[PDB]
């Protein structure tokens, strides 16, 4: 599924991501824009042979099981495929764990480089929330 911007904002809010660990909803919509372009089915092989999965490009290195990332953990206790669902619940659950792991949204390198310190509220402008 390819969400609209305000649609994804509403889905993140319904799933309690809005101001989770102090990150405004525009921070999470911005991260999703640049990780996946709002595509739940997005997958990207990392050079290290791990894969990133879904709207928030959650990495098989630590967070989900794809069966092909030697020496990885599955700290969200989910198959990485669950992170490609048109329902974002499992992605939101796992992103709550990632953002609590100590480095906030810096865990998303695209957030750090493209959203951090920017006017992220623009990502939820005009959204009926
Ligand atoms: Na893994």
7 is catalytic: no
Is residue 35 flagged as an active site residue? yes
CA distance 85 to 70: 24
CA of 23 to the centre of ligand 1 (A): 26
Q: Where do the domains of the chain lie?
A: 1-129
**Catalytic one among 7, 18, 48, 52?**
52
DSSP string, 64-123: -B-S-STT---TT-SBGGGGGSSS-HHHHHHHHHHHHSSSGGGGSHHHHHHTTTS-GGGG
**Can you give the three-state secondary structure of 25-51, one letter per residue?**
HHHHHHHHHHHHCCECCCEEECCCCCE
Q: Which of 18, 35, 48, 66 does the annotation list as catalytic?
A: 35
Which approach determined this entry?
X-ray
Q: Which CATH number fits domain 1-129: 1.10.287.370, 1.10.10.60, 1.10.530.10, 3.30.200.20?
A: 1.10.530.10
Q: Which long-range contacts (CB under 8 A, 24 or more apart) does 13-16 make?
A: 13/129, 15/88, 15/89, 15/92, 15/93, 16/92, 16/96
Is 101 labelled as part of a ligand binding site?
yes
């Amino acid at each position: 599924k390819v969400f609209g911007r305000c649609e994804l904002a509403a889905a993140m809010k319904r799933h309690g991501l809005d101001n989770y660990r102090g990150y405004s909803l525009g921070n999470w919509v911005c991260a999703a824009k640049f990780e996946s372009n709002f595509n739940t089915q997005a997958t990207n092989r990392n050079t290290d042979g791990s894969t990133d999965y879904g709207i928030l490009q959650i990495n098989s290195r630590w967070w989900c099981n794809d069966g092909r990332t030697p020496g990885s953990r599955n700290l969200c206790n989910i198959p990485c495929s669950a992170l490609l669902s048109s329902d974002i619940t499992a992605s939101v659950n796992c992103a709550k764990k990632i953002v609590s792991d100590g480095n906030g949204m810096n865990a998303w390198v695209a957030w750090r480089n493209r959203c951090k310190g920017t006017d992220v509220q623009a990502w939820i402008r005009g959204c009926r929330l």
